[PDB]
Design a protein. Structure first.
Length: 265
């Protein structure tokens, strides 16, 4: 954990990167952190809290999972693989869109959900509702992923986001059924094979949501269960000089550093 700190600092120095990490227990108590209260662009990681918001609405009855959301080609933006496939049919359901947002990082599907829930202002309100006074969504995709240096729009901190993850997965933010559904979606995420979970032991149960932003942002948030011990984790990195593959490797390396800490107990 001094090794944790110094191993992360070594990665930072050698990769010309900044690494923000928070690990918390199911009740949000701090296990470890590095630059844990530095703001970083959320990028696509917000799609996980967005899905949680959607499930809260399903749980309350203010939304219905199989409700059909109609759209045209205007909703197709960069990286909308599922939305493009469903375009001719003319709709995606609330649940289809949410699953695509989480597991494919589909931007069109994300924006479709934003259209339905009240836009960035409503996403921010949900963060506040679940005790997160830090995370903020200001824009839709892909512009929210601009990550202009210094911009506080569309940011979170590792500790705020890790606590948000814990509240959603362990802190009773959702019904047991909705919690299980979102957990399984995270485990089945299609975009994270080379990032955090690549650095964790293969018997840990891991689910996560990645992000990639301009100006070198590469992020991964979620949970892991090391045997019987449950943790929430948020990793945000900025590495402008690395290639895309090297950024993946950086996050996997952070996964290893996390593992080394966790295994020591």
């Amino acid at each position: 954990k001094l090794t944790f700190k110094t191993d992360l600092e070594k990665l930072e120095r050698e990769k010309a990167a900044q690494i923000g990490v928070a690990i918390v227990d199911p009740q949000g108590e701090i296990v470890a952190g590095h630059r844990m209260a530095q703001r970083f662009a959320m990028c696509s990681t917000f799609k996980f809290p967005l899905a949680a918001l959607v499930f809260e609405r399903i749980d309350s009855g203010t939304e219905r999972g199989d409700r059909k959301l109609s759209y045209g080609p205007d909703m197709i933006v960069e990286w909308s693989p599922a939305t493009e496939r469903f375009l001719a049919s003319g709709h995606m359901t609330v649940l289809e869109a949410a699953q695509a947002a989480v597991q494919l990082s589909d931007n069109g599907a994300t924006n479709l959900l934003l259209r339905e829930i009240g836009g960035p202002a409503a996403m921010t309100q949900y963060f506040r509702k679940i005790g997160d006074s830090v995370s903020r969504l200001d824009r839709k995709e892909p512009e929210m992923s601009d990550n202009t240096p210094g911009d506080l729009r569309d940011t979170t901190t590792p500790i705020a986001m890790a606590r948000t993850v814990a509240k959603v997965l362990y802190g009773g933010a959702l019904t047991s059924t909705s919690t299980h559904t979102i957990e399984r979606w995270l485990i089945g995420n299609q975009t994270g094979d080379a990032t955090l979970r690549a650095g964790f032991p293969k018997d840990w149960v891991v689910g996560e949501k990645t992000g990639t932003c301009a100006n070198g942002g590469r992020n991964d948030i979620g949970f892991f269960k090391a045997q019987e011990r449950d943790y929430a984790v948020a990793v945000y990195t900025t590495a402008p000089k690395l290639s895309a593959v090297e950024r993946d490797e950086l996050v996997a390396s952070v996964g290893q550093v996390i593992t080394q800490l966790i295994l020591s107990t």
